[PDB]
Amino acid sequence: SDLVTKFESLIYPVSFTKEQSAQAAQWESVLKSGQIQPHLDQLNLVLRDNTFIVSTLYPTSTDVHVFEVALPLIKDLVASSKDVKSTYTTYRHILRWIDYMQNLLEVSSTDKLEI
Numbered sequence: 001s002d003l004v005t006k007f008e009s010l011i012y013p014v015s016f017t018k019e020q021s022a023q024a025a026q027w028e029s030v031l032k033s034g035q036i037q038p039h040l041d042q043l044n045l046v047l048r049d050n051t052f053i054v055s056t057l058y059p060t061s062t063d064v065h066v067f068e069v070a071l072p073l074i075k076d077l078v079a080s081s082k083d084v085k086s087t088y089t090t091y092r093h094i095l096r097w098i099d100y101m102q103n104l105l106e107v108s109s110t111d112k113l114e115i
Helices: 002-008 018-032 037-049 061-079 084-090 092-104
Strands: none
Touching (some): 037 061, 061 092
């Protein structure tokens, strides 16, 4: 009970690399500084070639944390978009991952995005 909360407060899969670790820290830093928007293009390029943000076989808390910020942001960019198709084309790989993550996390009708 005490043990468990302590356990789950411990350290990331054991095959996690130094690079995966640094990239998780880096995204957490962009989240903390509120710079996800100027990092969207990069997020999109990462997801082009990687199923999940830090190249895992399952989503990590890094996926979840970035998603919380990126979902309403992308929803907003579509809303404000001068041409929606151009917007969809510009963030294809984020949209793919948004579709995955919002289903995984059983997201609300009304906060969910189209697709």
